[PDB]
Amino acid sequence: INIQEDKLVSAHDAEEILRFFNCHDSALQQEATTLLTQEAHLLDIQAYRAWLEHCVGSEVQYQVISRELRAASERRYKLNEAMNVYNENFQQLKVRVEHQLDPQNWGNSPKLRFTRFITNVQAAMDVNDKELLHIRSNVILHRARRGNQVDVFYAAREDKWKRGEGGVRKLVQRFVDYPERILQTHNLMVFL
Amino acid sequence: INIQEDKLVSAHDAEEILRFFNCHDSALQQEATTLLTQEAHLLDIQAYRAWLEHCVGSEVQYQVISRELRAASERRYKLNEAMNVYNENFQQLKVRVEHQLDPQNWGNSPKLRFTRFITNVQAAMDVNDKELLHIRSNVILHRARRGNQVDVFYAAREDKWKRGEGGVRKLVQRFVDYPERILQTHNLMVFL
Amino acid sequence: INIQEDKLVSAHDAEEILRFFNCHDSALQQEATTLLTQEAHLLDIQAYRAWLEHCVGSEVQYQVISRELRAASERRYKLNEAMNVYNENFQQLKVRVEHQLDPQNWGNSPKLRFTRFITNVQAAMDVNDKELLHIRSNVILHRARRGNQVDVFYAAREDKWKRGEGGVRKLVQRFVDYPERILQTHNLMVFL
Amino acid sequence: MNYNNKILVSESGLSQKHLIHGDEELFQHELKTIFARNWLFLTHDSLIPAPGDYVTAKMGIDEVIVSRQNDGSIRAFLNVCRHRGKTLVSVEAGNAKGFVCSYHGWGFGSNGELQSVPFEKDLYGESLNKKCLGLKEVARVESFHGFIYGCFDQEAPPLMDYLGDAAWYLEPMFKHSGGLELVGPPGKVVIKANWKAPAENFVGDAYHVGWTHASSLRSGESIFSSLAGNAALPPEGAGLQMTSKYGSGMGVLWDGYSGVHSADLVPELMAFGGAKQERLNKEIGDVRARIYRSHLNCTVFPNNSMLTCSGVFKVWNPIDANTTEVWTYAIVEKDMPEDLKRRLADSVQRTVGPAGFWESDDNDNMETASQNGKKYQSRDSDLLSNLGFGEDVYGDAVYPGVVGKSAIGETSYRGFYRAYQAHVSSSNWAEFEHASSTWHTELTKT
Amino acid sequence: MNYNNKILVSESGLSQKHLIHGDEELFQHELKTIFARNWLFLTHDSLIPAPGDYVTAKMGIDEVIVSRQNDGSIRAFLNVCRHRGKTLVSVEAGNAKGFVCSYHGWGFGSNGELQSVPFEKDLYGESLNKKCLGLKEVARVESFHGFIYGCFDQEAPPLMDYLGDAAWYLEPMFKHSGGLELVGPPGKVVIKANWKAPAENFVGDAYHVGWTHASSLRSGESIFSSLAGNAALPPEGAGLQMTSKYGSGMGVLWDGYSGVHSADLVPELMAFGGAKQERLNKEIGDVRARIYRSHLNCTVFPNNSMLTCSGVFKVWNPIDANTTEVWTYAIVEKDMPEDLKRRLADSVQRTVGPAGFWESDDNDNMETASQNGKKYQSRDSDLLSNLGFGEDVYGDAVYPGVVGKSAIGETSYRGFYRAYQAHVSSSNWAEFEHASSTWHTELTKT
Amino acid sequence: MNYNNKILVSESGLSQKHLIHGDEELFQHELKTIFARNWLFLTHDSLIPAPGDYVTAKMGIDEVIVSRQNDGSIRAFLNVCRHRGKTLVSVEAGNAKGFVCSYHGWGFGSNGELQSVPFEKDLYGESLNKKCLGLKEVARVESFHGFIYGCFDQEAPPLMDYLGDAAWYLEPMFKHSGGLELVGPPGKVVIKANWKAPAENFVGDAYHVGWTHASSLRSGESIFSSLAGNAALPPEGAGLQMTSKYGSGMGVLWDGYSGVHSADLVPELMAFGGAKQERLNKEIGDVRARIYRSHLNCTVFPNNSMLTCSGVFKVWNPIDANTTEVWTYAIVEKDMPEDLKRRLADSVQRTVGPAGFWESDDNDNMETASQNGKKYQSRDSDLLSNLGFGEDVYGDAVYPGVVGKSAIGETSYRGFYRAYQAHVSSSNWAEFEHASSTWHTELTKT
Numbered sequence A, B, C: 001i002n003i004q005e006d007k008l009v010s011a012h013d014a015e016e017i018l019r020f021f022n023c024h025d026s027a028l029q030q031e032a033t034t035l036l037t038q039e040a041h042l043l044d045i046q047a048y049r050a051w052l053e054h055c056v057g058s059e060v061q062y063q064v065i066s067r068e069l070r071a072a073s074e075r076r077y078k079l080n081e082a083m084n085v086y087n088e089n090f091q092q093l094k095v096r097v098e099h100q101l102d103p104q105n106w107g108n109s110p111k112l113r114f115t116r117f118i119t120n121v122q123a124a125m126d127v128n129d130k131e132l133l134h135i136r137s138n139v140i141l142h143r144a145r146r147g148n149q150v151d152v153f154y155a156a157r158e159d160k161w162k163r164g165e166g167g168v169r170k171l172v173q174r175f176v177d178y179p180e181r182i183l184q185t186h187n188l189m190v191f192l
Numbered sequence D, E, F: 001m002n003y004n005n006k007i008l009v010s011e012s013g014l015s016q017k018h019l020i021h022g023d024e025e026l027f028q029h030e031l032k033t034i035f036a037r038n039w040l041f042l043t044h045d046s047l048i049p050a051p052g053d054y055v056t057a058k059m060g061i062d063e064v065i066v067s068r069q070n071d072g073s074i075r076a077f078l079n080v081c082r083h084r085g086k087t088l089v090s091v092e093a094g095n096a097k098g099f100v101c102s103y104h105g106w107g108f109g110s111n112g113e114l115q116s117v118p119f120e121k122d123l124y125g126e127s128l129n130k131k132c133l134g135l136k137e138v139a140r141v142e143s144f145h146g147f148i149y150g151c152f153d154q155e156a157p158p159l160m161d162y163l164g165d166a167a168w169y170l171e172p173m174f175k176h177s178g179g180l181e182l183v184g185p186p187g188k189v190v191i192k193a194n195w196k197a198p199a200e201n202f203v204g205d206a207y208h209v210g211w212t213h214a215s216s217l218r219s220g221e222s223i224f225s226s227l228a229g230n231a232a233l234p235p236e237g238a239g240l241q242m243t244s245k246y247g248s249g250m251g252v253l254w255d256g257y258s259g260v261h262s263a264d265l266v267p268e269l270m271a272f273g274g275a276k277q278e279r280l281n282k283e284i285g286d287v288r289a290r291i292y293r294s295h296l297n298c299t300v301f302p303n304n305s306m307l308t309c310s311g312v313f314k315v316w317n318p319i320d321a322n323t324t325e326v327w328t329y330a331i332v333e334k335d336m337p338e339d340l341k342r343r344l345a346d347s348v349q350r351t352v353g354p355a356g357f358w359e360s361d362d363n364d365n366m367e368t369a370s371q372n373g374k375k376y377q378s379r380d381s382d383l384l385s386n387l388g389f390g391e392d393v394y395g396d397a398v399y400p401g402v403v404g405k406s407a408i409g410e411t412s413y414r415g416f417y418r419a420y421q422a423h424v425s426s427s428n429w430a431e432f433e434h435a436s437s438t439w440h441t442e443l444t445k446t
């Protein structure tokens, strides 16, 4: 991709394409698929502690941004382009997990229902850190509660995963640029 | 998963996780993916007889429940927790298929359009019955009719499949706990 | 499938089932999955030129129809059953790509956000043309713009792909019969 | 629109303006003149049997908590905190001595009383009159053989009187059978129809069954299966229709004890019903014992319907003029074997529940008839309910109410809509009574 | 709002209150004063050519069945059963001798008559007057060279008179060309715009083309391509604008026979049109032969639009004040080769259909202009349509109607909105006529 | 409903009719009497610092462009083209000398003036009076220490006077701290609540914190963490409440400088605030220096809220009676280290932003209290705000306004709703003033 010719493509997005077009390792894509299906299963059943223990690395950065709408031709206005809906280290994720599990989290009675659909999985090893696995995937996340509340989230996830305790691959970075600027889902209180 | 620590996780859900985390058989996951993609294709084109003949075992239980909303802390109220939206044996599924195919099913003219998206496939052989295959998958089911009616269903499916006539693997149990308590899709008259 | 017995199934749909039930080539399904995941990634990042160059064959027919609602029992009325939402050769796709990239396409500022979910991939080589690959897949396509506009598209895609320049497999036919008769998404200005 | 003057329903209930299914101002007026005034179904003893057991229910668009008291009575309260109006209870059923609000922690008893206020002493001192801050109570709560109804209007007739001539028909099944249980929890589905469309269909509509349900009749092999596609009309004297002063009414299809149930339940049901009928002959007489095991399609005005024998129990909960939340329970006879009760409950949902293949046959009929009520050229058009008019009787020696001695007709539509119009044009129960002093004469004209 | 008094459109059509695109009470008032009163497009002969052929169409928010009769005439009926108001026909097109309702099985003929009632003898006896229960018929159905329009108001002018001075402009293409065919089925898409936004844009809006469609002009290489991004204004005398008593109007862009079509169709179209023009010179004169092959952007009041030569045919079907269901057909000349007809139809959809890249350029303009009509500080603001005011003529020796002899202006907006205001403030056709007795004088002031 | 007469808020602000959170006619009336009349938050200097910098903002349901002028002033204009009413600007922020409409290309300056019209000479000649076609300007735009507010009503009090007695409380943080910056861009989320529910909660609601946020208090380990689950009530004299003539008010929780922030920020914040307080003692006095580092939960009437020290800044943008678009910014002290500013901003969003775990605790409370306002049996019911009534003072020697010298009460609800009712029942500012001439006497009764 030449971003001078493909005028709509960001430098960041062009960099991520190259990562996956280069080398294809079918077995790695299958490892990534398993890892993400298992993570999604733990989250769907609300095993948030198990998720932290089995899927999330101690050095994690878990980040979901929302980008201000700017003119495609904007070249002068220079201030903060985005805010962090999530920008969490391990301890901050732990605070959120404890909030979910607290028996006085009144919002969680009656129990919520989550169903996640993970697709478009791509996996590539880092060029420089042979132990860092880049995984890209898309998620549809369905949250239903209180009879008639239904919220559906849609996102692309740029992850880095690395082998940790016991040789288990764990999430060390998730990055999501959330596609909808104004949320129409009451909140974004779901782990994408 | 320790459900005393992961306070939000049901005993049933914890049991199903263990099933798939234990052993991973990549070829089995691929067999399951094919079986479910083919089943979904037959259903999408409304080949309901072909579905019964090729995908559904004579001993099938096809069950979709709806669970009453109860307090997360509820320990005394003991009455029927759920109702059966579907709880069908082979003959009952056959009645439904005949209803779909009847030329005086006025609701089916003009012809409906179905599109199913099957994801998050996991497969594991039963521990005790070496011929019983446990398959878990999620479905988004899109039903469109009469110009502007569009209904989208979301669910996780816990299946058991077993080799039957001609060595063909067929569905012997499907269980869905439907995530939305009050349906906003006119009805649940779709085979999840 | 006997369409005299399975009364709801079209001759066309019955023909496509047979294609994939016959032979299963697991490696081919994996090649198709990669090809479609990469195509979807290029489109999601709006690399429309790269898409044309890497994914689309010079002899392409890119067709999306909308079929008039007719009685299931209709046997006399004989006029045009469908219209073409898309029916594009390479040059016509190029016109559309140039329209997307034009700096005076005011509708594209602020930049749109696309996220595609590709599922249910099936692949089979043509019987007669050993170099023609039939690929079937389903897409959920999420388009978000201008703060609170969100449009979600759902479709099944019947593709033919063939090796072209440099031995790269490229799309030579896409056919979609769009499931919703009246669009509720402002337009269908997305590449399914 | 002037509801005192506007003729929404013509004399004798013969026609209704189609706008009644679509007009949102009339819907709002119904909240006042129909739903806040009349008896509405809440729950059954079997769902809240023990002290502290509660469920939530809709009454019109309002939500109530329905709670078994320590003394065995049932009281119902608006599900709204008396402080700043938060919804108190977010679940459908449970057991509790009281309910605490999640906003500021006010604690209400199962009896509605404001029992505790966090830090009351420090904050309010002795100045908060908790005695005056109990939950808003549903004025009237009464039982018909375990079926619990509520009414917001203290002036309403007692539930028994309100059922009028319909009560005689329900008693064999509701009382003389030994009692019914409601099997929960209900299915819940939203349809794009006015609440009156399904209400009128259940109250009086045997005419549609052969044609609308052709596919379900043929596929399921049920006892009414010969009707499929209008292949056959019921015999001479195959049933009757009735209606009553306060709007409730039903069809009676003689002997149809297995109802909508597919052939897998027909033999066992027909045996069970016949066996109880034989015992009942001695107790309540042959005619009423037969009624016990005859299929009754009934609406308890306004928005509660049922099919006895089929075991279907419905609430058509109003949301707006073209939206209704359908609750579907099963009813079973207490003395049925438990395994039969379980299969019967499953069969109710199978046929008329959220994925009920019969109920699916009805959807487009209900939804489009309701939505057409909004369309400009249809608003002032007349929905016809004249079938059997001039052949109804009142005061018959055997069958009470305004009665059509034929299985298929629109008698029960006429009585339903006569009552509806009398309420819509009245400000209170006294005015309804005055507007209904010649109800049966109006219905039996010509 | 008092529609007799409220000035929604200023004198001479010079401005309109922005609320007209957002006010739901006015939308409801339009159902009465615009849609129930005026001529609305239904279908074409080419879509229902043979006896029994039918289509469904919208007329305002109502749905009608449009049926070819045995005698070759066309009649149209509300798609609503005369019994309990169910939608009779659920498909878009077909062939049938009649329509049976799926609720209770009432059978209506293609001629609207109630032809059968299931078990009529047993149930109704001789008492049902079927003669009085035919489907509600559309009072007026007329044809303009195969294009079939309906009107619910018996008092309306004949369609030809209703087209007024616009008819002269359409005739070369609609009549002298040998006839047009409508190619179906249409694209159908919902947009979040008031029906008047696209109607006004097609009637009169050449000004927007260069800027709004800059990207489509540049990408597609069409004949108007030099306008892209306001790089160029049309030459002196590149066209004209017109409007008429009953609100219909159009722009004329001289010689633009290939219209919006991309360069792949330009040579073949320009040849075909030029060839027919040469033959027509002898028959209808040079000016009118030229009009035949000139691009006309026209709205037939209220909500039917077209681009001749481009071959675009639109219905802007109203749903509410900020929702419209857009139907898009192609029109082709009958004597074009079949392969050209097919490519032309595809090109119409390609450019202005559901995925029409041109139409996409318009979406935000239409949607936001309509939605801003609801915003508090904009409701009482004035939409301007004064371009070219004081340069329009009436009664010109060559070009009839109120005419602006310039390619770009707002003449046709002014006549459209003059007619709109005259209807909105009138109770019937007589009052519209009285309000329009000086229509052309009002438009040609200053 | 007659807004001159209807008592929506009882004397002394002691109760409000629950319908105020649900009634759409009242919502429409609020657009006029609340939103078009009062001061509304737009942006901060820090977001449009340089000439040509602009943002879009809501003012009620209207959208405005807010632009830094060449002379350093700020002007605001409706985001609506003066031609046919298209939305001019489709982005949230940028830098431009002007804005061109995408429909017909009209070009407006950053100063609102119509600066160019495509082909003006050829089309309009000298006849278009561009001087009269500038964008509709927001009459009043004023700054409170960099925080920019707008008002559509020229008759409004100056912003400083409008803040009334609330200004004294905000000044230590807004002015004496050295200045605040707003960190953008905001989070934006739609909730199904009336704008007044979150507005009242921020203005006056310390009572809910222990119970509503029990889980967030316990999980995050913040300075207010001892309140979790009503385990503890604040000490004697832990804070106060105040309110003001024009409706703005706040709670003060002494010393709570780290606010909602989890234990990872508590030590650094408590040090930073304490250090600045020590310097401020000498400049503004001990009491006001302490106020600087005390947690203020404030609503600037009507729909702008904040938590100082926590650094939360909210706009509750109205959409309809049960829909609000929540904008969430962070505020930081200019002289904080940049790394602290960044972590503080992230922590604001973490706690109360789109995925704010604290804000999630509030959702059901806000949404159900608002939606219950539509339910028939609740419309005429009374929301209570009587906590602390008869213990408020006015004209205190140290703390100005109507003041409750207790940390938890409903003083600020009463002043908020007194102002609300005075506006709703008044046609202009003069009438509000007349209705408010005894405002503090009304609030301090009994």
Ligand SMILES: c1ccc2c(c1)ccc1ccccc12
Binding pocket: D201, D202, D205, D206, D209, D251, D253, D260, D297, D307, D352, D358, D359
């Ligand atoms: C007689 C028999 C069956 C029914 C009715 C009347 C009326 C409504 C209904 C609805 C569903 C199924 C059966 C019925």
Ligand SMILES: c1ccc2c(c1)ccc1ccccc12
Binding pocket: E201, E202, E205, E206, E209, E251, E253, E260, E297, E307, E352, E358, E359
């Ligand atoms: C002149 C030329 C093209 C157009 C119009 C007027 C008016 C509307 C329109 C809409 C789509 C495409 C082209 C046009």
Ligand SMILES: c1ccc2c(c1)ccc1ccccc12
Binding pocket: F201, F202, F205, F206, F209, F251, F253, F260, F297, F307, F352, F358, F359
């Ligand atoms: C005192 C302390 C915290 C809060 C309030 C009052 C009021 C509203 C609020 C909302 C979110 C978080 C904290 C608060």
Ligand code: FES
Binding pocket: D081, D082, D083, D084, D085, D086, D101, D102, D103, D104, D105, D106
């Ligand atoms: S709203 Fe229930 S305690 Fe305050």
Ligand code: FES
Binding pocket: E081, E082, E083, E084, E085, E086, E101, E102, E103, E104, E105, E106
């Ligand atoms: S509604 Fe059509 S036959 Fe009854």
Ligand code: FES
Binding pocket: F081, F082, F083, F084, F085, F086, F101, F102, F103, F104, F105, F106
């Ligand atoms: S609407 Fe803005 S220039 Fe015409």
Ligand SMILES: [Fe+3]
Binding pocket: D201, D208, D209, D212, D213, D358, D361, D362
């Ligand atoms: Fe039915």
Ligand SMILES: [Fe+3]
Binding pocket: E201, E208, E209, E212, E213, E358, E361, E362
């Ligand atoms: Fe256009």
Ligand SMILES: [Fe+3]
Binding pocket: F201, F208, F209, F212, F213, F358, F361, F362
């Ligand atoms: Fe809170």
